[PDB]
Design a binder for this molecule. Structure first.
Ligand SMILES: *[C@@H]1O[C@H](CO)[C@@H](O[C@@H]2O[C@H](CO)[C@@H](O)[C@H](O)[C@H]2NC(C)=O)[C@H](O)[C@H]1NC(C)=O
Lengths: 35, 97, 50, 100
């Protein structure tokens, strides 16, 4: 989403589906990864 | 008839080496009894315990009685009863058949 | 009173109470019996409204 | 047990199939290339689990199941291995033979 550099306009937008990854596991927790 | 079918007392009665059961489940919630459970009790050799299994033959389970059935057994030798070499025949079954 | 009384009917179901159907039958069989009770109950409401 | 809505050791502890299910279940007898005379014990199924499985979940673990109330570790009166092997053999009846 292109946005103004800092402030949110708090407008409306929507996301599109990209992928179905059938891992088939119990997911209860998550974390992000640093580069 | 005043049966209940509380199976926690059987489990707690003695430790098991292995369950050696052909139908392990919680076996109801111990409040209500369902079906005629029955108990066909006898004492056999450790290899015979494995011989009596669904679809199995061997020497035992061809002689005596064939085992669809739940095999849940308190798999513990009554050492206090079998401590003598001459023993007794209180648990006999027709192994010759 | 008639509309409420109809809730005790079975309309061919094993029981008029939904919890007995879910307790006694496997999910797809419970769904069949539930659709049967749903049909009977919605027909009762359409009759009432008409 | 490989059908929507079924209950049993496989439907509940190894593989729950959806109730709203589209697809085909294809089965055939496989005594050939299996069921060796000495017992084919390469195939295992779960018999002890903490709870019933959700559709298509595959929880693959060797965690020791605690059957009793008193805590234990590894192996003991209340500690049982969760998987049960089955020895397939040519001498078993149809209901006890392997299927692919
Ligand atoms: C997914 O994982 C969670 C947590 O690891 C499981 O939740 C536990 O389930 C057991 C068995 O019912 C309970 O004794 C625990 O108390 C639960 N944990 C919590 C934090 O409540 C959950 O059961 C797993 N999903 C499946 C399908 O097994």
């Amino acid at each position: 989403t292109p946005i103004i550099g800092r402030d949110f306009p708090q407008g409306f937008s929507a996301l599109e589906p990209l992928v179905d990854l059938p891992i088939g596991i119990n997911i209860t927790r998550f974390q992000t990864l640093l580069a | 008839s005043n049966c209940v079918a509380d199976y926690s007392v059987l489990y707690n009665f003695a430790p098991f080496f292995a369950f050696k059961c052909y139908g392990v489940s919680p076996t109801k919630l111990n409040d209500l009894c369902f079906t005629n459970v029955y108990a066909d009790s006898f004492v056999i050799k450790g290899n015979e315990v494995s011989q009596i299994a669904p679809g199995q033959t061997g020497n035992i389970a061809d002689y005596n009685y064939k085992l669809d059935f739940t095999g849940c057994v308190i798999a513990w030798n009554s050492n206090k009863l079998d401590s003598k070499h001459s023993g007794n025949y209180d648990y006999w079954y027709r192994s010759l058949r | 009173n008639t509309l409420v009384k109809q809730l005790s009917s079975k309309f061919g179901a094993i029981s008029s109470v939904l919890n007995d159907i879910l307790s006694r039958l496997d999910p797809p069989e419970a769904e069949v019996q539930i659709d049967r009770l749903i049909t009977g109950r919605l027909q009762s409401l359409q009759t009432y409204v008409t | 047990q490989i059908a929507p809505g079924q209950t049993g050791n496989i439907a509940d502890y190894n593989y729950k199939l959806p109730d709203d299910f589209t697809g085909c279940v294809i089965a055939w007898n496989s005594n050939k290339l299996d069921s060796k005379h000495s017992g084919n014990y390469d195939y295992w199924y779960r018999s002890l689990r903490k709870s019933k499985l959700k559709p298509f979940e595959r929880d693959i673990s060797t965690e020791i199941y605690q059957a009793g109330n008193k805590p234990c570790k590894g192996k003991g009166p209340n500690c049982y291995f969760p998987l049960q092997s089955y020895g397939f053999r040519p001498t078993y009846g149809v209901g006890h033979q392997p299927y692919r």
